[PDB]
């Protein structure tokens, strides 16, 4: 048989903040044109 | 309107909230409680608790006291403590120091059955068993210790004495009812002057019977019958508060 409160004797760890999430990688930067010959 | 707590109540009463003593501790109790009683001077000697042991050798410990004193605002119950293995022979209790008190506070999980083992502390520490197990027998006494509020009176030489005029405590489901044994009966200091959610009441209006258990210390129970005017209080676990209560609430 099983009497008393609910619980476990396991040491509780309270579950922290979620965690953030994460921006594109960049892969994604701006393609230029030749820019020139200065002399 | 009663003198000292029954024991027998106290196990007919507590039943359901798992406060139990195994048969042939409860003859043996039965058979030895006046004895030692009657070896000391005390007028009073009741079982305190029963907390558990690793090997299966539970502890059974007693408290007793002679005359309640009233002294620098608060009751004093000068009280003596005795334990046991099994419910024949008692053992004393040694009281300990402050520092191996702060040092028994750091052990946890149950203590082992052998009063004859030592925990390492840390320079080291050796703690004997009998000193931890004193350590949280005073620390849960200190906690929780209930009584019906105005169920004790002051008298000439100033003792907190029973009061054989005791009326019954008015609105028993509410903690207004009870207090701590040390707070003097004529203040209005009450079971509910402490933190919010600490203590839970469970009532039956028809028998009219109160149970009031303490969530600081989960094995701590006490119960009211206003029909009889009859109270008293058990403990039964390890000598462990969980910390972790605010998140169980």
Same mark, same amino acid.
């Given at each position: 048989?099983?009497?008393?409160?609910?619980?476990?004797?396991?040491?509780?760890?309270? %579950?922290?903040?979620?965690?953030?999430?994460?921006?594109?990688?960049?892969?994604?930067?701006?393609?230029?044109? %030749?820019? %020139?010959?200065?002399? | 309107?009663?003198?000292?707590?029954?024991?027998?109540?106290?196990?007919?009463?507590?039943?359901?909230?798992?406060?139990?003593?195994?048969?042939?501790?409860?003859?043996?109790?039965?058979?030895?409680?006046?004895?030692?009683?009657?070896?000391? =001077?005390?007028?009073?000697?009741?079982?305190?608790?029963?907390?558990?042991?690793?090997?299966?050798? @539970?502890?059974?410990? *007693?408290? =007793?006291?002679?005359?309640?004193?009233?002294?620098?605002? *608060?009751?004093?119950?000068?009280?003596?403590? #005795?334990?046991?293995?099994? =419910?024949?022979?008692?053992?004393?209790?040694?009281? /300990? @120091?402050?520092?191996?008190?702060?040092?028994?506070?750091?052990?946890?999980?149950?203590?082992?059955? @052998?009063?004859?083992?030592?925990?390492?502390?840390?320079?080291?520490?050796?703690?004997?068993?009998?000193?931890?197990?004193?350590?949280?027998?005073?620390?849960?006494?200190?906690?929780?210790? /209930?009584?019906?509020?105005?169920?004790?009176?002051?008298?000439?030489?100033?003792?907190?004495?029973?009061?054989?005029?005791?009326?019954?405590?008015?609105?028993?489901?509410?903690?207004?009812?009870?207090?701590?044994?040390?707070?003097?009966?004529?203040?209005?200091?009450?079971?509910?002057?402490?933190?919010?959610?600490?203590?839970?009441?469970?009532?039956?209006? #028809?028998?009219?019977?109160?149970?009031?258990?303490?969530?600081?210390?989960?094995?701590?129970?006490?119960?009211?019958?206003?029909?009889?005017?009859?109270?008293?209080?058990?403990?039964?676990? @390890?000598?462990?508060?969980?910390?972790?209560?605010?998140?169980?609430?």
């Amino acid at each position: 048989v099983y009497v008393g409160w609910g619980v476990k004797n396991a040491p509780f760890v309270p %579950l922290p903040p979620p965690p953030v999430a994460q921006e594109f990688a960049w892969g994604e930067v701006e393609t230029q044109e %030749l820019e %020139l010959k200065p002399a | 309107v009663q003198l000292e707590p029954n024991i027998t109540l106290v196990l007919k009463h507590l039943a359901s909230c798992g406060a139990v003593v195994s048969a042939e501790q409860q003859a043996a109790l039965d058979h030895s409680i006046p004895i030692k009683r009657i070896e000391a =001077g005390l007028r009073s000697l009741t079982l305190w608790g029963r907390l558990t042991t690793l090997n299966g050798k @539970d502890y059974l410990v *007693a408290e =007793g006291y002679n005359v309640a004193s009233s002294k620098e605002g *608060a009751a004093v119950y000068e009280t003596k403590y #005795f334990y046991s293995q099994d =419910g024949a022979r008692w053992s004393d209790l040694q009281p /300990v @120091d402050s520092e191996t008190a702060t040092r028994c506070a750091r052990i946890k999980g149950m203590l082992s059955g @052998d009063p004859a083992k030592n925990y390492e502390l840390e320079l080291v520490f050796q703690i004997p068993e009998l000193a931890v197990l004193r350590c949280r027998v005073d620390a849960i006494a200190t906690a929780t210790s /209930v009584i019906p509020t105005d169920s004790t009176i002051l008298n000439a030489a100033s003792q907190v004495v029973p009061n054989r005029l005791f009326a019954g405590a008015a609105y028993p489901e509410k903690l207004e009812s009870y207090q701590h044994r040390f707070s003097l009966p004529g203040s209005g200091v009450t079971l509910s002057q402490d933190l919010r959610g600490t203590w839970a009441v469970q009532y039956d209006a #028809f028998k009219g019977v109160a149970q009031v258990r303490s969530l600081l210390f989960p094995g701590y129970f006490f119960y009211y019958a206003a029909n009889e005017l009859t109270w008293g209080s058990l403990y039964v676990g @390890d000598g462990l508060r969980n910390n972790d209560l605010i998140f169980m609430l």
